[PDB]
Structures are given as structure tokens and as C-alpha cells.
Design a protein around this ligand. Structure first.
Ligand SMILES: NC(=O)c1ccc[n+]([C@@H]2O[C@H](COP(=O)([O-])OP(=O)(O)OC[C@H]3O[C@@H](n4cnc5c(N)ncnc54)[C@H](OP(=O)(O)O)[C@@H]3O)[C@@H](O)[C@H]2O)c1
Ligand SMILES: NC(=O)c1ccc[n+]([C@@H]2O[C@H](COP(=O)([O-])OP(=O)(O)OC[C@H]3O[C@@H](n4cnc5c(N)ncnc54)[C@H](OP(=O)(O)O)[C@@H]3O)[C@@H](O)[C@H]2O)c1
Ligand SMILES: NC(=O)c1ccc[n+]([C@@H]2O[C@H](COP(=O)([O-])OP(=O)(O)OC[C@H]3O[C@@H](n4cnc5c(N)ncnc54)[C@H](OP(=O)(O)O)[C@@H]3O)[C@@H](O)[C@H]2O)c1
Ligand SMILES: NC(=O)c1ccc[n+]([C@@H]2O[C@H](COP(=O)([O-])OP(=O)(O)OC[C@H]3O[C@@H](n4cnc5c(N)ncnc54)[C@H](OP(=O)(O)O)[C@@H]3O)[C@@H](O)[C@H]2O)c1
Ligand SMILES: O=C(O)CCC(=O)C(=O)O
Ligand SMILES: O=C(O)CCC(=O)C(=O)O
Ligand SMILES: O=C(O)CCC(=O)C(=O)O
Ligand SMILES: O=C(O)CCC(=O)C(=O)O
Lengths: 447, 447, 447, 447
């Protein structure tokens, strides 16, 4: 009968109907804990099956992606698109190409995507997709043929107002190129708004490449200022060395912080006097090389396959690689080494035991649906540019991005306090994200 | 031979082809009277069967709307959509749910919509729709089911560039939600431009709820200033108590006037010190109660089922309920009692004998196609925002609404003056409306 | 390098990719166990990733199905449509509404449908779908609304040349009516070919009701015909009581044959010289009762509830209910009782432990995919009639159903000889099913 | 081995595959000469059959256009739409109605259009169309019937994101009205972005009428400044007397130059003291007369059917009529007479010999794809306004046009000097145009 028990019962239904999907469970569990708080103050938010509707995807698509390799052998990978919620706008979210991908992972990401997209203040619903295809070691022509095969099925389920994909792990500028190209061929339309993360001469927006890392740094700055500090002269750990990590690093150093290390999935680098960003980019973008190559070619910088990047003494930790990369034990050692701020660039990097640790140890924590929202926000700006056939300057778009991140910070911190959990940005994000979606779902009827 | 005979013989054919539609005949007759004046000076506005094309709807849809009530009983209502003219833009116009609705009524409203929409200066054609469904006493779920059944057929005839409905009598925010939600579900597109009057978190515009009533008051203020007067300190009658009336009342009293009465279909309330808007909104929108309840609960306010609201001594009358609610006897009484200005919030509220009494008694008269155009204007601003994926502030949109009502007034005043009927805004509005639609029609050929 | 190392490594990959779906794993294993044989003799059947393509669904759809109950209360169920293979024709297969339905099960049934449909000789591919919706204890309104909600998503993925569903458990004539009606509403097309199982006056086929039943028996008419054991008089234990079983029984006394009683998921029966269907059909379809409401009669019919349905004296046995109703103690005490033939009517009616108890125990099997194909065969005849706008007489359709069932037995016999496991009809069924589909995929390229 | 050999062999291919299309060979020849310069520095622009793809149209449509004349007599003309390249945006370019029209000509125009459109800076791909129809001598109703028949086939190959036509020789404001109107009828969409050159009250843009001639004069003005001279006080020849000629004349005279002659296909007029623009416009647009009538009605102006317009002594020649109207001998006559600047209002007016004479006589030469791009740049601005449902003022749009033409000149000059050929604006335009397009094509894959 109590809120606590209504919700725990749906969660047990959810476990039943979604068996075998631990990451999806993890995401829903974090959100449902926050919804308890919301339904204790405002019980009409449970009316008309709203929660049952919310955690069930509108549509899910799983399809065969055949493709021919350079030796002329045929392979078959699995493609996914989860269209989770469209109450606020077309489904919006990226595409992950990594051998780990399964439906459970795509759903975890699409579900998070709802609340994130809601927080942007922009008109976007949530979705995600990807494939268990492994782009590593493939030639451009293999990637191209895969993108083409994948988009051959996906084209009929997407569109400027329907579902707008983008990149993620394994999907950068190159793959979005092949995807968009082949979309136009399938549809016989130059429909710029169908994808975000496009190149600048064919419909893309200026700050999008930098957006997720910039936005994450902009958000952590807000958290730092609200505690009475400044990001200048702070020491920062950034896990990852892909799209998000690179630009979080760049923005942290423009604002006067020092990034004392970064990583790939092979290991990590200690850079106690900061990162040479041009160098890291030559290394990852041109050479496609490992973080260890940086260490060898940069004096002061040393490679490590032992322990964890989280063993470093820091003020601020920005996890920007993947889900569940920062466990309870990682969280203990950062707290013991003097870390006062954590903000997630990645989607769900912190395990639930790490998030509990941060709270017990009075560490300020920016959840991913808030701190990494600069990307999807800037994607929505790309969409807006496309719908107007306009093209904005870097300085204009970046200003928009700065203001979006401040406003997300502000609604997270105000919503948190409104519901009696001041400085708990998880609660704040989850509730503000949820309320905008729910109020739109109630307006629009049972659909 | 004579222009007079030509237009009159055509009107005679149109009574034959549209037998049994008095309201359509009445709207057509008033316009055609003004067209006689245009054609006496510029006979080439009659070329290419232009008037014969204008007065025949491009398309009319009538359809069965079956729905199930809360007792599991099946009901069947009739749905309508008239797509009248599309020379200037997509068909644009609201939906009326009321038990009096038939094809004649939908056509009168569609026809008027052509000229009003033209007058806004914005790129919108004319249509209207509705059903003979009666929303009164229906539950939210019964209304949702009706809207969903209604839109199951209508979805295929509408679209962002095709036909963009909105609300009207019986169709407000609630119903627009249900219609929009179901459209998205029928189309599988989050196509914001398909309806206007949407809610602020799913593609609506800031001033639209208030726009018609606000616009009506803006328009009448220009009429008033044209005579050397101000709206501040005037006593104003506003018939009706829905969307138009509420905000006409709100605007008028913000500008320092006093609204001395309002009404619904059951009777009328005398409010000599003005109207408490928040109390009337609670009664109408939360409780869906009669205006008699306002009088019960508000001191100074008296309920009447005898006589007419038009019996009150006023400076300004704003009919904001329905067609033919202010007749010739009403018009004499108003004039006798000191009324100097009439502007139509509603569509065609004044009967032809009432309009002539205003002419005989030199009462300044603002016809609905000009005075109530703020609504559809602000709707076009909703479509403009949606096309750009942009959201404008309340102040920005309200300022645009102001300029637009001032431009409309000016166009009606200058055009009347141009054609020899100074201060006859009916003539000016009809002619100014007509000329722009005609010029576009001639340019786009026989279609 | 060996033929058993491709197979077992793909079988192993397939366990990673489709984790948690053991029925699909089983069904893929048995089919692969047969492809080993085909490869030794015909090596080109593994070319161009043929098997990797065959075991991955062309497309899988999972969607939210919201619906409202008689109390005005919102529920959310999950709907499915797997469109496995279309090499021989449009996707073909039924819809199951039952609380045990999940992606794994739909996939397994859809996979088996490919080869079942291939064996018939007709232009049908394979698919399946349904929902976790529980049609037990629902009003007709609730089932209609559910059907309406379900078809509102499903209609955009189906069609006469695309995908043609049918009934199965939980989806009988009534549901097909509701689905077909709403399909027409969404499409604005009387597209009779979109579904099979339709009523007679709106595009149905005359033998469809009696087909799966008449099927199991036309098959036996060559299967026992190879041995002796009389062209008459043999007992038939008929495990089920819906469309397939009721009519399997109904196809009794063709030219003289004792019957014994039957079951559901409550309890079973035993009887003298017959079981007269007249009385089962008024209580199982038109009233919807239990098997207790037949067995309270029937001048002999008695009702057992704790034991097992496979402890009757046989000597022929015709299940026809769900997957997984014959295991360790049933299969061995089926054989015990000097007991000989079988012609099982479910989708995968016996388990992998029961199949060895029919192989080793010399039991002449009539498999799932071959002997109860008369249903799908007659679906295709419905598609044929719709395509030509013809309605065939009963005699004619029944005759065509006899031809088809001859050929299925023939191709099962001839191909089981051709690969030297002669009369293991499981094998020729399984190989002939595979080769037609494989051959079509090879001809049609990498798609 | 050499780039010279590689490109020349390709050209010999192209000559064979496209036999009998000289205008197309001519246009491809001049572009391929500039591309040799690109490949000697950056030879990976030939990667992935880039050039082979660029020179083969994406799609070409040739269709029957039947229509009935005012005497009830049936005629049959041929219609073309070539959709050349869509890398940078939807296909964009005009329609030509003239008796000389054939496929080879449409392709010449379409090919130039790719590079022109690239040069603007705006998101538009390349295409063109037309008909062999001769609108000379036809009634307005004949022209409407032809446009209606033409668009009955064309509408399905076009669209706001697909292909957006416009005017060109024989297709002005009147024809675009008929075309647009019929498009809306075919599509049932008020899709403003489908065409440019539209009228001001139905989605057109201010400045579009003037844009090509205006833009040409803005370009030549930059060429002149770059020699350290000034346009004011110069004598200018403008050939032609249609859309482009008219507004080049107006702009050149506004800037303080004297236009000393102009023409139609029947002869030329010598206007030693300048052109009376209002008079010309009245003769050409209202009376649809020959330029001889201008000479008859204006003292000091003289009609000539002898010799050539290019016999006049001038400082600047602006051919604004048609392809290959200024030949070898014409170029010598102009050079010898003191001409110092040639800018092309028309598409490809200067013969290959003419251009040689210019290079050798030190005459500055503004190729069409740069100098006449103001037209299509302003069409893209019309698309932009339409996509935003917005209307821009004349001042604002004409300032956008001025900046764009300055930027085109700048990119031609800089690019030409960059690749070792300073002041060769042909080289600069061709390389700058190619590079954006080629970059976009590489990103989008083999499509
Ligand atoms: N791109 C966006 O706009 C965006 C927006 C919001 C959120 N995100 C999230 O940001 C995260 C990374 O995104 P990205 O776009 O930057 O992807 P990316 O460019 O592919 O980079 C991912 C980085 O993470 C590394 N990585 C993968 N697994 C790892 C592990 N277990 N430990 C350490 N490093 C690991 C990769 O290294 P290897 O080369 O060794 O695999 C690579 O350096 C994801 O969680 C994604 O959902 C991205
Ligand atoms: N909403 C817009 O944007 C808009 C724009 C331009 C023009 N209009 C026009 O403005 C007028 C009012 O629209 P609304 O949107 O305010 O509708 P609404 O919110 O449904 O309100 C209608 C009001 O008028 C009264 N009324 C309705 N029918 C009546 C009748 N037949 N006799 C006497 N009183 C009656 C109603 O009282 P009961 O409850 O007793 O029926 C109610 O108070 C209509 O003529 C409409 O076409 C509306
Ligand atoms: N013509 C066709 O429909 C067709 C064509 C090809 C294949 N099939 C296959 O044939 C089978 C029968 O389907 P149907 O169309 O006859 O469905 P149906 O009309 O809904 O009847 C199914 C019957 O099976 C019973 N059952 C459930 N659990 C059982 C258990 N553990 N042991 C014994 N019986 C049980 C049901 O009892 P309750 O009512 O108590 O649940 C019910 O009497 C299915 O496996 C289907 O895939 C059918
Ligand atoms: N309109 C645009 O926006 C635009 C943009 C870029 C480029 N262009 C190019 O500019 C040139 C002219 O364009 P515009 O047509 O749009 O003006 P237009 O209104 O059609 O007028 C064209 C003029 O050229 C003359 N002419 C046509 N063919 C001729 C020939 N074969 N020999 C001698 N004179 C001839 C015509 O005389 P007659 O009346 O005697 O035929 C007429 O005065 C074309 O090359 C076109 O492709 C136009
Ligand atoms: O910009 C996008 O849509 C990609 C965003 C995304 O997938 C994410 O927010 O993690
Ligand atoms: O289209 C709208 O905004 C509703 C306005 C309308 O139909 C009216 O002008 O009465
Ligand atoms: O599609 C058909 O007709 C029969 C196949 C099937 O799986 C069913 O209906 O239960
Ligand atoms: O504006 C257009 O697209 C028509 C003009 C054209 O085709 C051109 O630029 O030559």
C-alpha cells in the first residue's frame, strides 16, 4: 500500500519481464528510488499507469546486419534501436558499435536518455541504439559497408521528427558520415535533421565535437562554485581518451585546472604537470594508437597497467569512458585521497556502491544525465540549425551550451532542495527530468 | 451586366447549391456586399471564375466518430473538416465540439477564416472543423476516447504544411493534448506543427492561451484611440465565459477598464465593480460550473436568467461567446444606453440587423475577422516557432501580437478609406482580406 | 577445419548473443544437428554466411501496448513480432496472447515456423508474435481495446506481401475479427490478405477451422500405411482442447477408428468406443468452460486431475497444445503399453529427452513441423483465395489440403532416404525444410 | 601515370558515354583543366572514383509532356530534370523553357550548378531541368496548361529536401506561380520550400527578382577594385533583356556606370547615354515586346540587326543572355576596343576561344559559376526563410547578397593565388567549388 511498496512491486515486475538485463535494472533502480520521493509529496504522478508506461519502451527494433569483409567473407552482426519515449520530442540518442552491446545495454542507455534529454530544456524525447559489431581493426571500406547495411534497415524507422540518431562509443565523425550518406540514398532526401554529429560542410554544428566534455567541465565548475571553491588550480582525473575525455581535458585546462591523468581500456597515464592535448589527439585521432604511446613520447608522463587511474590523489574526478568503471572501492580510495567533486562525462560510470560512498563521505556528485547533457543539448541545437537552414558561429553555440549547463545545474540543485535532499544532484536530476516528461505524458493521453 | 446583378445572381446560385445552411449564407452575404465595392473599381478581381472558386471549399470531410462511454455503451457522432482555401498557406483553423455543429456552421467558420487569416499578414490558409459531440458532462476518459476516435480519421488529412487545426468552442488545452498525442501515435512522428494551442512543454507558444481575448482588447483600444478616447475608465460588457472572454476580461481590466458583466449559455452575471478573474477561472476551468456559482460566491455579483446581458449600460461591448448572440434589438438597446464601440471576440456574434444599427447609430464596429485575429495570429507564431525549433518569451510574442493587432486595425481603416467608406472596418477588413487571397490565387492558376 | 567445428563454434557464439533463451537454443541445435548431414554431402550450403543469416531474425519488434480496463485503469503489456525469414514469401505465423510469452519464446516459435512453412510447398516465409497480455477473465470490450491498441502499432509492419499474422493460443476467431477491423481502420484499405483465420463473410476460407486436425490425419494416411496395424480402429489420445486438438479429434471415424479422451492444463479423461465432438464444441468454444464441464457427463467420460495425460493405453497419440508436454516418465510409459505410432500436433510438442525415447524405442514419429502443417497450409489457401477474390467450396479446399499433405509426407520420405536415415521423418522434414529456404537465400544474394 | 594522362583518358571516356552533347563536353572540359591543378598538389581527391562519380549525374529524368493549345490541338513536348549532385544539399537549380533545350544542355547547366552552388557557402546541391516547349506566342492559359502538365510528372521527383527548382530562360514569375500552384494540388501540401522565385504573398523572398543581375554587378565591382579602378564612370555592355540583364543594368547604373547597350535574340540597341530602366521593363514585361520597340520610343537609342552588340566600345562586358553568345572574334573586338573586364551573368556565354583571347589580352574574367551565383544564393535564402516561416526585409537580404558576392570573389582570388595562378578566377572558382563538394562526398561514402 505505501509508495515504497507500490514502487518495489513494479520493480519486481520489471525484473520479471526484463530478465537478464542487469544494466537496465541498475538504471531503473536509481531513478525509481528518486520517484519514491516525488510520489510521497505528489501522488497524482502515479495516475493513468504513468510509471508503467514510462519504463516500457514505446518501440524496440532488433535486426540482422549482414556485411561482407575485405576477404570477401560474409558476417552477420546484430543491430538495435530502442525508441523509448517521445512525449517531449522525437526520440533522440546515439549509436554504440562495440562487441558488448545487447538489448539490456541499449535500454539502459535509452532510459537514461529520457531524463537527460528532458533536463536540457530542449524539445527531445529519448532513444538509443547500436550493434555488437566491432569497428576496431576494420578497414574504412568494412566500416562503410557495415554502416550501409545497418542504415539499410534503420532508415525506415528514423526521420527529422521521428528519431534522430548520433554517435557514442564506436561511432564518431567517420561513421556518421557513412550513415547519413546512405540514409539520403535510401530516402532520396537530403534530410539534414535525421542525424546529429554531422560534418560542418554538410549540416553539422560548430561546438558539437567539443560539447560533451566542455559541458561536463561547465557543470563541474557550477558544483565547485556552489561549494565556495573555483575550478582554477584544481587537480583533475579524466578517465577515457575518446570524444568526451579529450574535450573535458581541453576545457579543464583552459579554465586553469590541471589534468593529472587519462586512460584507455588497456591502461592509464599519469601526467602530473598536465596534458598536451594536441599530442593526445595526434595519438588517438591520426595514429589510432594506445595511451602508452603518449607516455613514451612525453617526458614527465608514465604508463601504468597496474592499479587504477582512481588511485591518483585528486580534487576532482571526471569518469568519461564507459558504464561501471568506478566501483565502491575506487570511490573509497578517491575519498581517502581528498577528492571533493565527481561528475560523470560517461553514461553510468559510477556503480551504485560508489554513489553511496560519495554520499556517506560528503563528496559532491554530478550524475551523467545532468553533467554529460551538453552533447545531446548541442545535438538538439544542430537539429534547430537544420530546421532553420541556419548555421551558427562557434561563439554563439558555445554560449548557448554554457547557459544550458548552468540552468541544468540550477534545476538539479533547486529540485533536490525543494524535495528535502539539498546537494543530492541525483535526486534533483531524476525528479526534474521525470516531472517534465510526466506532465507531457498526462497532457497527451494514453498512447 | 451591372456588378450588383452579377454578384447577386452568383449569391442566388450559392443559395441553391448550399440550401439549408443559413449561417454560411449569412457569412457569404456580408463578404459579397464588400466585394461589390472592390469590383466596381477593379472589375478584374472577377476574372478566371475567381469568386466562384473562392466561395467553394477546396475540400470538405465528414466522417463517423464512434466512441465508447464509461458504461461501455457505443455512441456515434459526426466529425467535420472543411479545408476552404490554401492560397496563402496551409489550411488553418480550429475545431468546435458542440451539439449544434453541422456542415453549414463549419463552412461559415471556414469561410470567415480565409479573410481573417489573410488579414494577419502571416502565411496561413483557411479551414475549420468540429463535431456534434457534446463535451459537457463527459469524463476525462470519455473526452480522450472521443478525441482519439476523431483523430483516427482526421490524422490522414492534416499535417504541418497541409492543415493545422486548433481549438474553438468545446476544444481547449485538454482536448488539444489528447488530439496531439493520438496524432503522433497515428503518424509515428513528433510533428509539432500539426496543431496549435499545444502545451508549453510539448511545443506550444507562450501567449496563445491568452491571445484571442488579449488581441480583441488590443484591437478595440485602437478603435477607441481613433475617437480621442482611452480604454482606461470604460465600462465593458463581455459575453461568454470561456477562453476568449476570460482573457478579454483580463486584458481590459489590466488596461484600467471595468468589466460590468459576463455570461454563459444558461444566464448572465452583473458585476458593477468588475470581475475577479482568478475566481472565474477557478469556476470555469477547475469546477466546470455555471456562472450562477460565481454570483452565489461573489458579493456584488448578481445572476440573471431574464432579459439580456446587452441590457447593461456600457461604453464598450465585446461579444465573445457565439454566432448571432447580439441581434438588432440588442443593438438598439446598447446604442440607447450609451455604447460607442463594439468589437467581436467571437465569430459572427452580431446579426446583419445589428450590424446596420451600428452603422445607423455611428457605433464604431470591429468585425470578428479583424478583432479576433490575434488568436490565429499567435497560432501562426506557434507554427513559426515549431518550424524553427525555437521557443520565444512571453514578452517577445506579446509584443508581436500588439504590433499585429495595430497593423490589422490600420489595414482595415486605410482600406475602408481607400474605397470610400471611412471608419467602416467591415468593408476594410473584407476587402483587404480578399485582395491578398485573390492576388495569390490568380498567380497560382486554376487549381 | 572440420564440419563439426564451424557448427559448434557458431552454436557457441549463438549462446552468447541469445543468452537466456533456451527454447530457441534447443530449436537451433536440432536444426544444426541436421545441417551437419547436409554439409557432408552438399558443401556449398554454408557459402556466403548462409547459416549465420538464417539463425538471426531479419527483424524483431517489441512494443508497448497500453490499454484501459472496465474500471478506467491503465495497464501496459508488451507485444512482439519477429519476422524471421522471408526467402520464400511474406512472413507468416500466428499471434499468441499468454502471460508466459517473451522474446525468447517468440523467437523459438518463429524459427520453427520457417521450416514448417517451407515444408508445405507454398509461398510463405516465417514469423511469429503476440503478447504477455492475459486474455483470461477479460470482457469483450477489454479484449477489443487490447486488440485495437496492439494493432495500432503492428499495422505499420504488416501487409499482404509483407507479413500475414494468424491466431494461436489466446488469439481465436474473435480476436482476428478485432485485429482485422482495426487494421482496416488504420490503413483505410479492405486488405483481406493481411490476416488469416478470418470469418467466412469477410474473407475467410472454408476449411481453416478443421485444417490442423484434418492435417494430423491425412498425414497418418501414408505414415501408418507403410507398416500394417489395420487401415481402421486405432486409439488416439489427443492432448489438448482448442482449435488443433478439438479438430484433430473431430477428424475421427474417417473410415472407422476408436478415440479416447483429452486434456487441458487442469485434467484428462478415459472412454469406451469414441468421444462425440458435438458435445465438446458447445462447451469449449461457444461457452468457454473447463474439461470438468465436459467430463461431468458423458455416459462414460471421467475426470482425472493428479497424475499425467500419458498413462492411457494408446496405440497412436496426438498431443496439440503447447511446447514441452512429453519428458522422462511419459515418453517411456508412452512406449510401454506395446505402443507404437505417434503424430504430434503442437509447436515442438516433445522435449530432447522424449525424442531419444522414440528413436531408441523404434517409435514411428510424425513430427511437429510436418503433420500439423495443415493449418498454415490452409492459411496460405486463404491468402490465395483473397489474392484472386475467390471463395472456394469446402470439397475443393479440403481436396487441395489432401494434395498438400501427401507431398509433405512424400518430401519427408524421399529426402530421409536420399540422406540415409530413411523413415526418421524428423530428419527428412528437417532437411527438406532447410534446403528450399537455403536455396532461395543463395539465389537472392546477401540481404 | 601523370595526372594530365589520368584526367585526359577519363575525358575521352566521358566523350564516348555522352556522345553528341557538346555543351556538356565544353563545361566538363574547363572544370577538368582546373582539376589537373588540384591533383598535382593533393592527389587523394581522385580516391574512391571521386571524379568518375562527380561527372555522372545521380539521376536524370526525361518525360513526355502532353498539352492542348487554345484551338483544341494536342502537342507533345519533352521535359527534363537532372539531379546532378546532392552532397551539400538538396538538388537546386532552375527550369529552362526554350526550343533549343535538350538533355546535353540541361546537363551542362546542372554540372555548372554543382560548383556554383558550392561557391555560395550555402547548403544546396546541383541540378537543372527544362523543356523544349517554346512559350513565345502562347496565351497565359496555354502556358498554365503546359506548366500543369509538366508538374504532373515533376512533383513526384521534387520536394523541399529533395529537389527545389526555380526559373531560368523562359520561366519567370508567371510560370513559377502555375508550377507551384499545381505542385500543391498534386501533393496536397502547402510546401513553400519546393520552389524558389515565388511571389511575395505566397512564400517568395525580397531581392530574388533582382538578385542575379545585382550579384553579377557586385562581383564585377570587386574584380574592378582589385585592379585599382572603380565601376562608377565606366561604360558597360549588357547583352540580353530578360531577368538577369534587366537588374544588372539597374545595378550598374545605380553605381554610377552607363550601360551603352543591350539585346534580345532579334537584335541589339545602342544606348550611348544609358538605359531607361522603367521603359525597358514596361516594354519587356507588360507588352512582351522586342527591343526594337525601345529604340522606336526613345530618342538617342538605335536598333541594329547588323554586326554585334560586342562591336560597341566599352570598359566592361556583361553577357546576360545565353550560352556561347560571346565568341573568339567577339573577344578580339572587345579587347581591341578597350574592354578590360568581362563578368558572366549568363551560364557559359564565353566560348573556349573567347576565354583564350581574354587570358592573352590581359582582360579580367569573372566566370558564370561565380559571378551569377547571386541568383541561387538568394534562392537558398528563400528556402531558409521558408524553412523558418519567416520573411526578411529587402535591406537585410540585399546586404546578405553583397557579403556573399564579396566572399565568392575573395575565395576565387585567394584560391587561384593559392594554387599558383593568381587572378585566374576560373581556376579559383572551379577548385574552391570542387573541394567543398569533394570533401563532403568522401565523408558520405560510395552512394
Ligand atoms: N560522444 C558523446 O557525445 C557522448 C554524450 C554523452 C555521453 N557519452 C558517453 O561517454 C562515454 C564515452 O563516449 P565517447 O563518445 O568519448 O566514446 P569514444 O570516443 O569511443 O571513447 C571511449 C573511450 O573509453 C575507452 N574505454 C572503453 N571501455 C573502457 C574501460 N572499461 N576502461 C577505460 N576506458 C575504456 C576507450 O578506449 P579503448 O580504445 O581502449 O576502448 C576510449 O578511450 C560513453 O559512456 C558514452 O555513452 C558520449
Ligand atoms: N479560442 C480561440 O482561439 C478563438 C479564436 C477566434 C474566435 N473564437 C471564437 O470565440 C468564441 C468563443 O470561443 P471560446 O474558444 O471562448 O469557446 P469556449 O472556451 O468553449 O467558450 C464558449 C463560451 O460561450 C458560451 N456559449 C457557447 N455557445 C453558446 C450559445 N450557443 N449560446 C450562448 N452562449 C454560448 C459558453 O457557455 P456554455 O458553457 O453555457 O456553453 C462559454 O462561456 C467562438 O465564437 C469562437 O469561434 C475563438
Ligand atoms: N491451426 C493452428 O492454430 C496451428 C498451426 C500450427 C501450429 N499450431 C500449434 O498448435 C498448438 C495449439 O494451438 P491452438 O491454436 O490449438 O491454441 P488454443 O485454441 O488456444 O488451445 C490450446 C490448448 O492447449 C492447452 N494447454 C495449455 N497448457 C497445457 C499443458 N501443460 N498440457 C496440456 N495442454 C495444455 C490449453 O489449455 P488452457 O485453455 O487451460 O490454457 C488449450 O486447451 C500450439 O503449440 C501452436 O503453436 C497451431
Ligand atoms: N534567372 C536567374 O536567376 C538566373 C541565375 C543564374 C543564371 N541565369 C542565366 O542567365 C541567362 C539568361 O537568364 P534569364 O533568362 O533568367 O533572363 P530571361 O528572362 O529568359 O531572358 C533571357 C534573354 O536572353 C535572350 N536570348 C535567349 N536566348 C538567346 C539566344 N539563343 N541568342 C541571343 N539571345 C538570346 C532573350 O531574347 P528573346 O526574348 O529574343 O529570346 C532574353 O532577352 C541564362 O544563361 C541563364 O541560364 C539566370
Ligand atoms: O547527441 C546525441 O544524441 C548523442 C547523445 C547520447 O547518446 C548521450 O546523451 O549519451
Ligand atoms: O487556428 C487557431 O489558432 C484557432 C483560431 C480560429 O480558428 C479562429 O480564428 O476562430
Ligand atoms: O500462420 C498460420 O496460419 C499458422 C501458424 C501458427 O503458428 C499459428 O497460427 O498458431
Ligand atoms: O535560383 C535557382 O536555383 C535558379 C537559378 C539557377 O539555376 C542558376 O543559378 O543558374
Amino acid at each position: 500500500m505505501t509508495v515504497d511498496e507500490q514502487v518495489s512491486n513494479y520493480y519486481d515486475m520489471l525484473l520479471k519481464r526484463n530478465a537478464g538485463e542487469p544494466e537496465f535494472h541498475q538504471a531503473v533502480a536509481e531513478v525509481l528510488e528518486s520517484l519514491k520521493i516525488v510520489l510521497e509529496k505528489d501522488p497524482h504522478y502515479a495516475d493513468y499507469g504513468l510509471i508503467q508506461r514510462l519504463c516500457e519502451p514505446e518501440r524496440q527494433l532488433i535486426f540482422r546486419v549482414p556485411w561482407v569483409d575485405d576477404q570477401g567473407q560474409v558476417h552477420v552482426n546484430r543491430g538495435f534501436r530502442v525508441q523509448f519515449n517521445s512525449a517531449l520530442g522525437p526520440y533522440k540518442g546515439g549509436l554504440r558499435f562495440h562487441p558488448s552491446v545487447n538489448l539490456g545495454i541499449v535500454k539502459f542507455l535509452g532510459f537514461e536518455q529520457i531524463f537527460k534529454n528532458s533536463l536540457t530544456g530542449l524539445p527531445i524525447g529519448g532513444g538509443k541504439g547500436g550493434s555488437d559489431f566491432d569497428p576496431k581493426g576494420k578497414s574504412d571500406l568494412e566500416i562503410m559497408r557495415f554502416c550501409q547495411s545497418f542504415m539499410t534497415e534503420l532508415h525506415r524507422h528514423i526521420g527529422e521528427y521521428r528519431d534522430v540518431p548520433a554517435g557514442d562509443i564506436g561511432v564518431g565523425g567517420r561513421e556518421i558520415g557513412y550513415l547519413f550518406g546512405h540514409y539520403r540514398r535510401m530516402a532520396n532526401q537530403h534530410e539534414s535533421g535525421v542525424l546529429t554529429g554531422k560534418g560542418l560542410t554538410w549540416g553539422g554544428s560548430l561546438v558539437r565535437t567539443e560539447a560533451t566534455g566542455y559541458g561536463c567541465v561547465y557543470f563541474v565548475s557550477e558544483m565547485i562554485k556552489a561549494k565556495g571553491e573555483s575550478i582554477s588550480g584544481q587537480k583533475i582525473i579524466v578517465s577515457g581518451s575518446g570524444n568526451v575525455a579529450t574535450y573535458a581535458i581541453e576545457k579543464a585546462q583552459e579554465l586553469g585546472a590541471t589534468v593529472i591523468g587519462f586512460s584507455d581500456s588497456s591502461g592509464w597515464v599519469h601526467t602530473p604537470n598536465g596534458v598536451d592535448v594536441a599530442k593526445l589527439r595526434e595519438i588517438k585521432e591520426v595514429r589510432r594508437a594506445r595511451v602508452s604511446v603518449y607516455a613514451d613520447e612525453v617526458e614527465g608522463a608514465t604508463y601504468h597497467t597496474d592499479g587504477s587511474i582512481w588511485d591518483l590523489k585528486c580534487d576532482i574526478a571526471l569518469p568519461c569512458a564507459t558504464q561501471n568503471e568506478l566501483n565502491g572501492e575506487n570511490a573509497k580510495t578517491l575519498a581517502d585521497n581528498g577528492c571533493r567533486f565527481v561528475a560523470e562525462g560517461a553514461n553510468m560510470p559510477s556503480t551504485p556502491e560508489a554513489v553511496e560512498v560519495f554520499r556517506e563521505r560528503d563528496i559532491r556528485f554530478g550524475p551523467g544525465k545532468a553533467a554529460n547533457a551538453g552533447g545531446v543539448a548541442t545535438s538538439a541545437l544542430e537539429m534547430q540549425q537544420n530546421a532553420s537552414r541556419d548555421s551558427w558561429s562557434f561563439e554563439y553555440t558555445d554560449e548557448r551550451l554554457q547557459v544550458i549547463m548552468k540552468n541544468i545545474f540550477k534545476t538539479c540543485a533547486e529540485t533536490a532542495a525543494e524535495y528535502g535532499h539539498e546537494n543530492d544532484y541525483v535526486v534533483g536530476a531524476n525528479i526534474a527530468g521525470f516531472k517534465k516528461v510526466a506532465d507531457a505524458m498526462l497532457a497527451q493521453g494514453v498512447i
